Subunit: 158 residues, 3 copies
């Protein structure tokens, strides 16, 4: 559905490219849509509150501070996102239960896996300016990702 | 047969979690059992001795110094560990012939792949305290691993 | 066809081993042949030039300077490599459109993936001495690689 390479050829400099630090973990090889940013650290309470809303055509971009000590997303939360039609999740942190994640019809990009789950006190901020992988994100921007990489741009692409 | 994420939910602080530095090279997605520690470096003679014994319900945890210059395990040694029913191998170092290892009914977690094989003089220690990936291992401890990660239950 | 571990057991110090910094992106597990080198940086013009020539029994060793900001090889270019029968490509740089490359009957070893394609000015040097991954590659040498690693040999370890 989304070929980031071709998109890069077409839109050239009008698109930002994320450093190659991520890999697919979800059941979808590629995905994209309008983003909603979240800023948290080893706590996915907010992620739950946000994924509780419908997300068709939307991608959750999580600035998890890059922590690989706690997984922000696991099978349950991923199932909630699928429940509410989210296109995908981009976690600047880690995921969990990878085997099960590969079976969920949703895109998931993260830096690594770790068996320990994050807390759920819901601390953090949503819809704020976040930056990671040498890229600044804002709710409203549009992101596209596939097995080759991840790109961000203000306007939708297609 | 094992789910490290689930176990972490159950045991929490009661189990240690190895830093996310390993990859899966064996035919088994998950494996686990009581461990036997081995310390050595770019030499696997000792491993031959150990794997020659039965390993049902056991996992061999090899502190290979994290060397990615020599492979401590290859198709031959892995088929031996399989022959002796070893649950799996966790190598803090490198493995070889990954294409063959993927087809073997045994767990294998290692740092990387390297075509050059390890020597077989036999130097090294067995049943010793080893530390890597921010975790210390002791023979008798119980290890569990899958595609999500590796955890160690201190016995 | 090629088992670099076995080759290492047989040839020992007569073969060189590249640092384990590469991953398989092609549809071919193992490959090998005489090498043609290329020194460039975020510009695949020369690669297209060289891949135009028949590459049966040949492997294109590309010193892309280790950049992962620009991909030197994509579906288009890899297809050309296939059509002209190249054995495989070893890119000390980035590749692109991975899902396409995994399907092509050619060996592809690269540092990583990145959606931004490289330029095509054609800047760079062909068939020159290049060094990366702790190994120096000379035009004419022989390279063999598989999922465990990549090794270099002065003389042929295979046929032709």
């Amino acid at each position: 559905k989304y070929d980031t390479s071709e998109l890069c050829d077409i839109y050239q400099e009008d698109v930002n490219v994320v450093e190659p630090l991520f890999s697919n973990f979800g059941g979808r090889a590629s995905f994209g849509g309008q983003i909603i940013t979240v800023k948290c650290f080893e706590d996915n309470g907010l992620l739950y509150d946000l994924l509780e809303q419908n997300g068709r055509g939307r991608v959750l971009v999580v600035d998890g501070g890059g922590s690989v000590r706690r997984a922000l997303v696991d099978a349950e939360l991923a199932r909630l996102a699928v429940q509410n039609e989210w296109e995908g999740l981009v976690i600047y942190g880690a995921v969990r239960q990878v085997d099960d994640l590969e079976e969920l019809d949703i895109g998931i990009q993260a830096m690594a896996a770790i068996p320990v789950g994050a807390a759920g006190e819901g601390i953090g901020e949503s819809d704020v300016r976040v930056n990671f992988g040498g890229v600044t994100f804002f709710s409203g921007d549009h992101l596209y990702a596939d097995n080759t990489g991840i790109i961000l741009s203000e306007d939708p692409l297609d």
